[PDB]
Design a protein around this ligand. Structure first.
Ligand SMILES: CCC1=C(C)/C(=C/C2=NC(=C\c3[nH]c(/C=C4\NC(=O)[C@H](C)[C@H]4CC)c(C)c3CCC(=O)O)/C(CCC(=O)O)=C2C)NC1=O
Ligand SMILES: CCC1=C(C)/C(=C/C2=NC(=C\c3[nH]c(/C=C4\NC(=O)[C@H](C)[C@H]4CC)c(C)c3CCC(=O)O)/C(CCC(=O)O)=C2C)NC1=O
Ligand SMILES: CCC1=C(C)/C(=C/C2=NC(=C\c3[nH]c(/C=C4\NC(=O)[C@H](C)[C@H]4CC)c(C)c3CCC(=O)O)/C(CCC(=O)O)=C2C)NC1=O
Ligand SMILES: CCC1=C(C)/C(=C/C2=NC(=C\c3[nH]c(/C=C4\NC(=O)[C@H](C)[C@H]4CC)c(C)c3CCC(=O)O)/C(CCC(=O)O)=C2C)NC1=O
Ligand SMILES: CCC1=C(C)/C(=C/C2=NC(=C\c3[nH]c(/C=C4\NC(=O)[C@H](C)[C@H]4CC)c(C)c3CCC(=O)O)/C(CCC(=O)O)=C2C)NC1=O
Ligand SMILES: CCC1=C(C)/C(=C/C2=NC(=C\c3[nH]c(/C=C4\NC(=O)[C@H](C)[C@H]4CC)c(C)c3CCC(=O)O)/C(CCC(=O)O)=C2C)NC1=O
Ligand SMILES: CCC1=C(C)/C(=C/C2=NC(=C\c3[nH]c(/C=C4\NC(=O)[C@H](C)[C@H]4CC)c(C)c3CCC(=O)O)/C(CCC(=O)O)=C2C)NC1=O
Ligand SMILES: CCC1=C(C)/C(=C/C2=NC(=C\c3[nH]c(/C=C4\NC(=O)[C@H](C)[C@H]4CC)c(C)c3CCC(=O)O)/C(CCC(=O)O)=C2C)NC1=O
Ligand SMILES: CCC1=C(C)/C(=C/C2=NC(=C\c3[nH]c(/C=C4\NC(=O)[C@H](C)[C@H]4CC)c(C)c3CCC(=O)O)/C(CCC(=O)O)=C2C)NC1=O
Ligand SMILES: CCC1=C(C)/C(=C/C2=NC(=C\c3[nH]c(/C=C4\NC(=O)[C@H](C)[C@H]4CC)c(C)c3CCC(=O)O)/C(CCC(=O)O)=C2C)NC1=O
Ligand SMILES: CCC1=C(C)/C(=C/C2=NC(=C\c3[nH]c(/C=C4\NC(=O)[C@H](C)[C@H]4CC)c(C)c3CCC(=O)O)/C(CCC(=O)O)=C2C)NC1=O
Lengths: 289, 99, 172, 162, 162, 172, 172, 172, 172
């Protein structure tokens, strides 16, 4: 659990405990649980009062429908498919289902293989049921508990890849899931089929380097093969990712955000020259040596 | 061709080109790797005089002739006081090359 | 997620020593003016719907391109979402001036909403001007005193205008 | 960080509503608490070093075996005494931090959340810290309602220990 | 039912812990509130009937069309006036209930939760109720901190209306 | 989930009228003794781990069949679950005497836990005797005056013993 | 950086065999219609400044928020950069329909400019609509024949609209 | 890279109107106290080497682990780099209080030095405490008057302590 | 997630032929020494808590900045998380030397935890030194013979030190 950097990772927004529905909940408590379910399943997208699905929603407040089954009902509703399935690629649909219904990002490509086959065989409804009716789901939170993201915790079953992929899936409390920087393109699948994760980036008023993205052409490993063979220095290599190179104009810079492998001995000069360009350093990570 | 008129097959550096095709190495770092290369030092730095070498390398890297002999005299001190590596580092990060 | 007191506690723990005396006199004066901070906060809170409606009222009088078809706040659904975004910003301003720290306002809005408005195509300039006008109207509503015992609320105007300018600059 | 204003904001945020009179009741109550609690925290800051040494001596008195047996968990050598009066001062500093913050949040985030596994891994008996906290809550020398809520925080630490 | 003691128990239950000093701070604050709020609720109980008639007359004054046009939503006939002063007294009774309960819970459970769809289905303008609540908060005649928190509850009802 | 005040509010709403005067004088006396109710609640809360350990200490001295192999609380895991069940019951007692109503204690434990102990094979008699002994020790810990101003807390002995007997009878 | 011919050559080399006959008949028909493509391209190229000025003319009539102060294309320098960005996109469209392959348009613009417009705060929606309107005007300018021997530009209209939609979707 | 005046100009341009009168009276008072700001800056600037040496002197007395072998500032080269890092931070503080805006301090060191100290393995806590001690000594050196007419420098102490706390928090 | 045998199977399937004879003799020698690999693995496994406590014991004696307030492993919760991180690394080392392949250690820790420690602000150097000291103590505990028949375990110390150095370098 990530406390010291919670300010800059946005975890301190989500530090609060999971909501629990009780045996005999009060009338008002069901509406609060409904608000949390609507937020997490629809990824902070706001629901208008006309689209509230009050017919299935009232059965929850009666107690006919368990909170897990309420999550299933809102996942298989039509407005969900319009928000999430329809305008997205199916690996992106699979990643969003893993984020909403379990909390964690998918770990490997073999995880995507099963759900992708299941969609084509049986439909999205059975696919959603297989997300929700999993041993992983039932173990990590109960049916009464609204699903939450569980990545900062090891929780005895997380790989390390899940924590770094979760930050690509979630960008702050204010951010709305339909509306992100990547847009329609799945962030995790290019990382996932090569089984390589990128250094994570925070959001803005925390850190202005968000603007950086890993473009489709150039894939950078984050590991310098030379250990400064190319850089021809004996010092150690870092990896510096800059988000917005504004001051050189069109003929001078073709891309506003790129990465550079810099030795430590000439790192300060690189920071100065890059800062004079109006560039914003998203993250500096150790690369080699 | 720009750094040392013709490059023989022994002259070429498999490390520098090999790093260049990935994207780990930028082309100015390839220029530095050609400048601090031993065959460039042997052909250019050992045979020429110090002031003549400063003239030649300023011509090649900056793309411009040196303004006067006084400029080459001014730059020639960095080479011996700090080494050719620090001189190449001071020559590549000027305003003119970066602009 | 920090108070004033938790901010002094975290700073004193990072120092590793006990809290110095001058910080305790500062916190005593804060405890004396904390009610002063918040009675006004209460008069800020009670008029919140009038504040957001007057702010959108002046903003859409000022920039009629948003109401114009093809504008970002043109559609009825989008216009309701716009009023929702403004009301959320005002609510987190009231939370930050309740706890006396800008870290709650940072935590809950700022780091993500700039990228959200970029990705949505939302013009950050109009909502920045709207938060500025809402903050000006909020201090103007707070400063006036009607049927309330007089007190020096001047220190707060500084802090409230700080919170509103932080929100407007983090929006951009 | 369970402090009253923070948890009031968390309630109003999870409900999705504005602040009501409930949070203002919480606030006039919190200011009533802090109006004595800050001066009591300053008084504990004054008496802190002698309280730490007295707690360490009472802990050595009730458990004399820890001074005798060779073992890096026990304070037989001098580095054990430095580290161990250091964690006495840690406990007292967390008590003062909760006195300033107005809730059990700072001790819950800085002490309690991992103390059980740490005492499990390091062969530290928590009863030593219970004895030290009992000596502190006996010898802090405050009076009145500040003394009662100081004893409340120390008893909370005791119940979290064992 | 958002009342301070209820929500304190809900916080302590959802956290899974015992009660701490935070809830006792909430409690001395709530008792401080109720120590004037109960007498203010009794005073509103005394002045209730004249306040209801004055609010109804002010609503007929500001919106004179409702007395004139034929329509079962409008109070042109007598049954409209009976039902409509009945819901004036409903609003005032919910104000007194929130004054006793110490939170916006009773109005939130008895009035607010469905008022929007009811005014949508029945062609009732909420501005009528806003005018009536404004007349009540002008004419209740209390003084001091009880008057400020009474105005807080009425302003909360106004903001929940429109 | 009810307070004292919400209980009077729900009763007055089911009556459909305003709150009568005598109920308001009763609630005024409740507001005068509500702190009295809860300072003791605080002295009940501070000794909770000692209360549950002494209660299990006397109970397992009293019924050694539970500690005996094959007993219901014999296994280390089951014994930890037993102490957890007792601590939960004490915590909800403290919640009910905080809010001044038994409806929270009913809501959170009572209706299900009797059937739970039947289905588990848990003997309801031993846990009933344990809750009774824990309640006796709790009133005994609450009633003694140690550096506290003299108070009337006896009626509140009435209420606390009522809550403990309700828990012990709903367990059975 | 690929032609049509180099695309067939790279595919035939990845197959590892010689070029099949049907691909050669396809390339013969391509060589017959490549001038057809060339003629269409030249009438697209000659009116390029009129195309970008009319496209920005309709776009800034359509979205006046960009011209409004605080808008992304408000500043004179930024507005010149906006016209430069549009002219660059049109030029690489003309290059891709010259070489008959979208790989040049991909290589030179697409993979980076989406991230560039995200990092700059540039709204991708307006420039997407501008590239769509520019492409509609470009096909409308190409399809009319004035003093030109009759020919079928229709095969090209498919390809040119493909290139423009690829640019508009890669912008987003 | 902003002044006070350029900050008001950018805000007035984002509003799109002329500068309001109250902002001009604020800027007139700023022009009256800008020399006042400045006098404090010059007496801060003249003692800069003493400030950084006393700051490192107290810091390495306070945390002897950095001087200890294996420590982050142990090596002579690394210790010189540490004094260089501190002097750079003090210089950009003096620049920001020269221009009267924190945007220069943000631009120059704040955006990329937190990640730099993470990647280097530099403990952010020690340099945060060092910047805090350097700022305390800087205000202590500025506030005493030597050869200066008595005047109100209270506003400046607020601003300088703001800049130092912004630097110490952005370091973390 | 690969064995030794599944590694040879995947390589032979990528070759597309059957397994060659020399690989089968290598796997026969692996099957002869696989018990040799793992009896030691068992003596590595039995002392795991002593290994991680001695490793943290030497590490926090070596770098007292982590124990110092403001340090990364200073807080009790964070210190427990630190011991948890170390125990996890040791467990996956034991898994990789159980299956005889480093692919399990790669799969479960390596690719993500470097970025995790960067994002957390965790110094990678201290945990790298701790994994190195833990590995040195692990081979030192494995190599001594207590109540074990003499055997040639030369392959094992090489392989275990390889796994530990891979973990320490992937941490960095
Ligand atoms: C299965 C593979 C796996 C790994 C490797 C893993 C690492 C991991 N270590 C973490 C924290 C941590 N890891 C450390 C460890 C250290 N920091 C130091 O100061 C020392 C250099 C080092 C001790 C060796 C510490 C102190 C934290 C706590 C950070 C915090 O809670 O703020 C976190 C943040 C969430 C949390 O612990 O509760 C993760 C995800 N998680 C995994 O699931
Ligand atoms: C708790 C913090 C928090 C913030 C700040 C937040 C903002 C936020 N505003 C959004 C939309 C919006 N926000 C606006 C607001 C505006 N656009 C304009 O034209 C004006 C410049 C401005 C009015 C001030 C509009 C119009 C939309 C609708 C976009 C759409 O639905 O397509 C969305 C997309 C999802 C949705 O509303 O339903 C998010 C996530 N969300 C959060 O959870
Ligand atoms: C060869 C391929 C290539 C592309 C595509 C490219 C785009 C590009 N557009 C830029 C700026 C820009 N691009 C735009 C364009 C627009 N913004 C709007 O408001 C409209 C939605 C749209 C007009 C269609 C504007 C206004 C800027 C200026 C941003 C600034 O200067 O702050 C910049 C920042 C540096 C600079 O212009 O001088 C780049 C790198 N550069 C390239 O080298
Ligand atoms: C939540 C219900 C509630 C309210 C509303 C409340 C308000 C409130 N405001 C107070 C004081 C005050 N309130 C003000 C406020 C102001 N004076 C001015 O001239 C300014 C224009 C204005 C601020 C903008 C002042 C100056 C005082 C003086 C006493 C103090 O510092 O608290 C006090 C002190 C105690 C008392 O008056 O009996 C109360 C009760 N207390 C409550 O429990
Ligand atoms: C701020 C809250 C906080 C607490 C409470 C804390 C406790 C704490 N005490 C520790 C060790 C210790 N704790 C003790 C304490 C004692 N042993 C005795 O014999 C005495 C009875 C008692 C003296 C009070 C000693 C002697 C050590 C060093 C033993 C060791 O190697 O692990 C350690 C392991 C670190 C190390 O090995 O140096 C932690 C994390 N750390 C914290 O950050
Ligand atoms: C305890 C909280 C509570 C409220 C607020 C409440 C309002 C309420 N007012 C109603 C009707 C009404 N409401 C009004 C009120 C007015 N019309 C006017 O012209 C006047 C401006 C205003 C007088 C105050 C009238 C005249 C009706 C009867 C109209 C009808 O058939 O629906 C109805 C429909 C029931 C019916 O048709 O008789 C409800 C539920 N009910 C509740 O249980
Ligand atoms: C043995 C039976 C018995 C009890 C239980 C008892 C308690 C008791 N606590 C009292 C007061 C009080 N008790 C507290 C206690 C606290 N307030 C807080 O906010 C803190 C969190 C907490 C201490 C930790 C306070 C603040 C008072 C105020 C009055 C006083 O100073 O006595 C009083 C004063 C007289 C009265 O209330 O009628 C009584 C009776 N008296 C008795 O005869
Ligand atoms: C680089 C300088 C250059 C140009 C510009 C050029 C154009 C050119 N276009 C031609 C034909 C033609 N060009 C077109 C083009 C079209 N007809 C339509 O109705 C469509 C709307 C439009 C395409 C969109 C057609 C239909 C022909 C008929 C002859 C042919 O197939 O080439 C020919 C055949 C030979 C001739 O006309 O003398 C020439 C010369 N040749 C050159 O050397
Ligand atoms: C213009 C803005 C700017 C900043 C802020 C900056 C920081 C900076 N500090 C660095 C190193 C350093 N910075 C420190 C400073 C410290 N470490 C400690 O132990 C203490 C906690 C602290 C003393 C206050 C040290 C010791 C190094 C040396 C690391 C090394 O050489 O391995 C480096 C690595 C390259 C090098 O110094 O020569 C950079 C880039 N560079 C810049 O261009
Ligand atoms: C670069 C050469 C130079 C210097 C040194 C300089 C200083 C300087 N300080 C001034 C004012 C002042 N300077 C101070 C400074 C202080 N008063 C206190 O009591 C504080 C302890 C202290 C700040 C810590 C004050 C209070 C004033 C009043 C006038 C003003 O606001 O400028 C003025 C106003 C014009 C004048 O005095 O004739 C001058 C000239 N001007 C120059 O051109
Ligand atoms: C899980 C319970 C379990 C254990 C513990 C176990 C150990 C074990 N180790 C064995 C062999 C052995 N174990 C060793 C180990 C070593 N010799 C050295 O000199 C080195 C220092 C050291 C390795 C570091 C050697 C050399 C042999 C020889 C036989 C063989 O290759 O298996 C064998 C072979 C069969 C036998 O001894 O009866 C057993 C049973 N078997 C089990 O079922």
């Amino acid at each position: 659990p990530v406390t010291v950097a919670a300010s800059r990772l946005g975890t301190a927004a989500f530090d609060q405990s999971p909501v629990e529905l009780r045996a005999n909940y009060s009338r008002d408590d069901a509406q609060t649980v409904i608000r949390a379910v609507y937020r997490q399943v629809l990824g902070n997208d706001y629901v208008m009062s006309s689209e509230r699905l009050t017919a299935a929603e009232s059965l929850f407040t009666n107690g006919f429908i368990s909170v897990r089954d309420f999550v299933r009902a809102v996942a298989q509703s039509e407005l969900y498919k319009e928000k999430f399935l329809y305008n997205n690629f199916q690996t992106r649909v699979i990643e969003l289902n893993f984020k909403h219904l379990l909390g964690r990002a998918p770990y490997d490509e073999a995880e995507v293989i099963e759900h992708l086959d299941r969609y084509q065989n049986e439909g999205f409804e059975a696919d959603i049921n297989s997300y929700i009716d999993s041993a992983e789901y039932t173990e990590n939170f109960g049916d009464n508990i609204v699903p939450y993201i569980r990545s900062y915790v090891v929780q005895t079953g997380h790989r390390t890849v899940g924590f770094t992929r979760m930050f690509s899936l979630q960008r702050g409390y204010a951010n709305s899931d339909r509306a992100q920087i990547a847009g329609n393109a799945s962030r995790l699948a290019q990382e996932l089929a090569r089984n390589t994760t990128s250094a994570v980036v925070g959001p803005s008023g925390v850190n202005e380097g968000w603007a950086f993205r890993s473009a489709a052409d150039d894939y950078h490993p984050g590991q310098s093969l030379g250990g400064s063979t190319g850089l021809s220095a004996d010092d150690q290599v870092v990896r510096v990712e800059v988000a917005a190179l504004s001051t050189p104009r069109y003929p001078r810079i073709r891309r506003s955000s790129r990465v550079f492998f810099v030795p430590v001995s000439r790192l300060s000069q690189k920071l100065q020259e890059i800062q004079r360009m109006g560039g914003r350093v998203a993250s500096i990570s150790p690369a080699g040596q | 061709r720009q750094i040392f008129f013709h490059a023989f097959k022994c002259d070429r550096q498999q490390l520098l080109e090999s790093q260049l095709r990935n994207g780990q190495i930028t082309v100015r770092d390839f220029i530095r790797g050609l400048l601090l290369s031993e065959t460039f030092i042997d052909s250019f730095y050992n045979k020429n005089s110090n002031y003549r070498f400063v003239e030649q390398c300023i011509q090649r890297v900056l793309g411009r002739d040196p303004f006067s002999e006084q400029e080459k005299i001014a730059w020639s001190i960095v080479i011996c006081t700090k080494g050719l590596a620090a001189f190449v580092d001071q020559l590549l990060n000027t305003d003119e090359y970066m602009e | 997620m920090f108070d004033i007191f938790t901010r002094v506690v975290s700073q004193a723990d990072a120092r590793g020593e006990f809290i110095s005396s001058d910080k305790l006199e500062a916190l005593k004066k804060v405890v004396a003016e904390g009610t002063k901070r918040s009675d006004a906060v209460s008069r800020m809170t009670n008029n919140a719907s009038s504040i957001v409606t007057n702010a959108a009222r002046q903003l859409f009088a000022d920039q009629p391109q948003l109401i114009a078809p093809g504008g970002n706040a043109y559609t009825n659904r989008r216009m309701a979402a716009c009023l929702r975004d403004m009301e959320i910003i005002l609510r987190y301003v009231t939370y930050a001036t309740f706890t006396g720290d800008a870290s709650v306002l940072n935590d809950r809005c700022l780091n993500g909403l700039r990228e959200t408005y970029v990705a949505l195509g939302v013009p950050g300039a109009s909502v920045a001007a709207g938060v500025r006008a809402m903050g000006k109207a909020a201090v103007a509503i707070v400063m006036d005193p009607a049927g309330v015992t007089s007190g020096d609320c001047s220190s707060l105007q500084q802090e409230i205008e700080l919170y509103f300018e932080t929100a407007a600059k983090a929006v951009e | 960080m369970k402090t009253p204003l923070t948890e009031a904001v968390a309630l109003a945020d999870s409900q999705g509503r504005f602040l009501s009179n409930t949070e203002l009741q919480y606030l006039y109550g919190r200011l009533r608490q802090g109006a004595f609690a800050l001066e009591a925290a300053q008084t504990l800051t004054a008496k802190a070093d002698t309280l730490v040494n007295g707690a360490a001596q009472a802990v050595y008195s009730k458990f004399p075996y820890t001074t005798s047996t060779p073992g890096n968990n026990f304070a037989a050598d001098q580095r054990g005494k430095d580290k161990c009066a250091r964690d006495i001062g840690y406990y007292l500093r967390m008590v003062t931090y909760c006195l300033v913050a107005g809730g059990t949040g700072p001790m819950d985030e800085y002490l309690i959340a991992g103390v059980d596994e740490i005492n499990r891994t390091f062969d530290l008996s928590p009863s030593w810290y219970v004895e030290a906290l009992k000596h502190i809550k006996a010898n802090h020398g405050l009076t009145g309602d500040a003394a009662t809520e100081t004893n409340n925080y120390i008893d909370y630490a005791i119940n979290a220990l064992s």
